[PDB]
Amino acid sequence: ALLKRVVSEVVATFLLVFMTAGAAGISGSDLSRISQLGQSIAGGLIVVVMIYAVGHISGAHMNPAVTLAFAVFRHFPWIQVPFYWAAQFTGAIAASFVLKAVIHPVDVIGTTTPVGPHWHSLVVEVIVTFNMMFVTLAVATDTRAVGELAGLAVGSAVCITSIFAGAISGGSMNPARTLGPALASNRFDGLWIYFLGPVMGTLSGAWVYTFIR
Amino acid sequence: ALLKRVVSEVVATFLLVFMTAGAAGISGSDLSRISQLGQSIAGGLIVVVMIYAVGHISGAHMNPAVTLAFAVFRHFPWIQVPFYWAAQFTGAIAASFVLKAVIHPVDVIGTTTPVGPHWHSLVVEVIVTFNMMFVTLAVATDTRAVGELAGLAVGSAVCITSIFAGAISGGSMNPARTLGPALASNRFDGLWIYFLGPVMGTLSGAWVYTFIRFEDTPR
Amino acid sequence: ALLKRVVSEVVATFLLVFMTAGAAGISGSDLSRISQLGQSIAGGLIVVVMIYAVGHISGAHMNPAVTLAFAVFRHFPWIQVPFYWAAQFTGAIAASFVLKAVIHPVDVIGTTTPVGPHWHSLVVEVIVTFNMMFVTLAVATDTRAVGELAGLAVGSAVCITSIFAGAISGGSMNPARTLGPALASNRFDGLWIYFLGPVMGTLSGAWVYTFIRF
Amino acid sequence: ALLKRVVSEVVATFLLVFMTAGAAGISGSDLSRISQLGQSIAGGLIVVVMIYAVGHISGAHMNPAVTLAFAVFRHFPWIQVPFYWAAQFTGAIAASFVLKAVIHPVDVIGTTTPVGPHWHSLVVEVIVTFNMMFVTLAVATDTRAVGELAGLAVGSAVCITSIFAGAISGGSMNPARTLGPALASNRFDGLWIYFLGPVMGTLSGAWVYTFIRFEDTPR
Ligand SMILES: CCCCCCCCO[C@@H]1O[C@H](CO)[C@@H](O)[C@H](O)[C@H]1O
Ligand code: NA
Ligand code: NA
Ligand code: NA
Ligand code: NA
């Protein structure tokens, strides 16, 4: 079971970063090849796809901050958390180095970096990650919520992040989605934001939902 | 119960306004940062997200004119209306001022103000608000409707309003969503429209659905 | 009950046309106010909204050609068809003239008129209307289909029609949605296409679905 | 019952290619007529619509590589594979020539051809087709998946393909949807990629889903 969940998360996060960072990097190189809104939509839709494809096998976390929040609030076994982390970072990094080849001569592989003061990007990442984790705890753990629509709801949140936070921080919510492209592009500006921001956001969204449910 | 629902409404209206106004304001300052269509899609999607997040906790009104319409048509208890109201205005205002901090130097924080003669904005806000409350009453209160799709159905209305009414009134339907950004941006052009228009919209959309949901309608 | 269904259809069709022709007319006037894709998206979304609002009351036909095809294939009673037709045209025409006042000085109120040779628009209206009626009959009348997703499915078809057929015929599928704006705009080019194409479209789509269904 | 499924696949594949290649071709002639994003959305939405129309009839394959993968992994009878392939190629080519008539004087009919080095298009077609088939096998065959949402999930994969792979290979995943337009355009650049790529993509996607769907996978 653990092996199949690990493979599921490797593949789901690989596809998440491949489509998200691929569309972002091509768009950033030339808006006539992929529009800004088009790359934001693609980032939302790949989360929709992965949730309906493996949400019932691994839970489709694709995101180390999400796995952490689920474990902290007793929705997921702590013993599996390092494995999920190993899987998500592995898939994100593989995706990014595959892109670095197949979208060449584009050499900024859909990184998330801050526009403007870094603290803007800190606060925005926290809030938009909160929104995503808040709805995630509802649709993934509350029988009173509409679980069949989990994919649409979480993808919607990712799309929002991409449209709005994309203009400030690049709209990550996801240390692995950030770190892969950063390595493939050798671009690390503000990297710590994309670790601290999302963890704060996932832990607070979860906490607030756990209070109100 | 009540306090959880207040917290729900404050968080949901905050996140509604943060995303709606922040995307609309950044877009309004520079369309290469966020496209017009992008800021409208974000507006609809945040309402989808919040309905799937808290519809089963507080009803995810996130809008005082919706709360009012629900109470008037006996779907929501009057005693909690002020609490919901305070939550929504609180969240909206808090969000607008966090935006004012973090989208700086953008200074117009996604306001809704009239394009052209103000009665165009009044008529449009009533009708697009009617649309949103009409479908809301159906999906939230009618067992024959598809309650599981409430978020998608209401968000779709919100998206239409942002696309079409965005070009005339700014597409609010939501007195708190208008007022927060107004205070944060010191822009109040036509502000009364965004109270009267949505109230008339929700009351009338609720009234019409109430008339058609029953073959023999009471009263 | 017929009264409430007629009111349902007047309201739903008014709103379909108000949003669809409103967005199209403002976009046609100035793409910086509403984008081309934006107005297409609004056209699909209002059908989503109306199907979830009144599909369980009147069936959210909103379209005389759809009402007709439902009745021909015995899914809807013939005696209500004229009332549905009256409701639909009435709502469409009223919304169009409401638009004429509130989007002034825009004066083309979101019409659907052909681009290039008229017969292109005829064929395309037939085919895109087939697609919409085909999915409609599955989701509205086949218990093996996903009835809960009917609004999403039918609205999707409407959005495709706006995006693609919008470049050829204006993408109507809907005699009332075309006639309302035509009257409000005083523009009638190719009007007959938007009666005959959609009727052929809905009848043929319903025929083929009726043939393949189990 | 086979004739009904064959008619279902002719019609579904015809409408898939009619709307996908029609929008792509008009957009490729003139972005002011249909936007690039718009034609991408049309491509995803027609798959949504066809899955909800005929998923319960024929299974809404509309794609010979999908039929192939379903049959290899014992979800579809081998004996019907040639009938579905015949249906899909007939529907697709017929749609292409109808378009050639009604979008004239546009003469490139929504073709999928490589941008840049052809090997990129091979790799990308494999990966994006893998994504499509992976979710497909979940929602069409796994009782734990949300089958009612199959249309939306598969249409979403198609949309992503059109947006991202559209800038590299044209985003096909579908030998039929490539071949029809190529014949009608007299345009065959890198055609083999749209046979090999999608076949590799659906087989490996179906393989990896088969691997992960069971704790103890038979073999
Ligand atoms: C991952 C590497 C895959 C190897 C295949 C590379 C794709 C080459 O591409 C092919 O190159 C041929 C030249 O031999 C040309 O004749 C074809 O037109 C072209 O499509
Ligand atoms: Na539930
Ligand atoms: Na219901
Ligand atoms: Na059903
Ligand atoms: Na299921």
Numbering used by the authors:
A (entry chain A): 46 to 258
B (entry chain B), D (entry chain D): 46 to 264
C (entry chain C): 46 to 259
Manuscript excerpt for this entry:
Silicon (Si), the most abundant mineral element in the earth’s crust, is taken up by plant roots in the form of silicic acid through Low silicon rice 1 (Lsi1). Lsi1 belongs to the Nodulin 26-like intrinsic protein subfamily in aquaporin and shows high selectivity for silicic acid. High accumulation of Si in rice shoots is achieved by the cooperation of two different transporters for silicic acid; Low Si rice 1 and 2 (Lsi1 and Lsi2).
The structure of Lsi1cryst reveals a tetrameric fold similar to other AQPs from bacteria, plants, and animals. SF of AQP1 is narrower and hydrophilic (Phe58TM2/His182TM5/Cys191LE1/Arg197LE2), and that of GlpF is wider and amphipathic (Trp48TM2/Gly191TM5/Phe200LE1/Arg206LE2), whereas that of Lsi1cryst is the widest and hydrophilic (Thr65TM1/Gly88TM2/Ser207TM5/Gly216LE1/Arg222LE2). The most striking feature of the Lsi1cryst’s SF arises from an additional “fifth residue” Thr65 in TM1 (Thr65TM1) and a water molecule hydrogen-bonded to Thr65TM1 (Wat9). In Lsi1cryst, however, Gly88TM2 exposes Thr65TM1 to the channel, thereby making SF wide and hydrophilic. A striking feature of the channel of Lsi1cryst is that a large number of water molecules at the extracellular half of the pore are not in a single file, which is brought by the hydrophilic SF in the broad channel. Therefore, unlike other AQPs, the channel of Lsi1cryst has two polar faces.
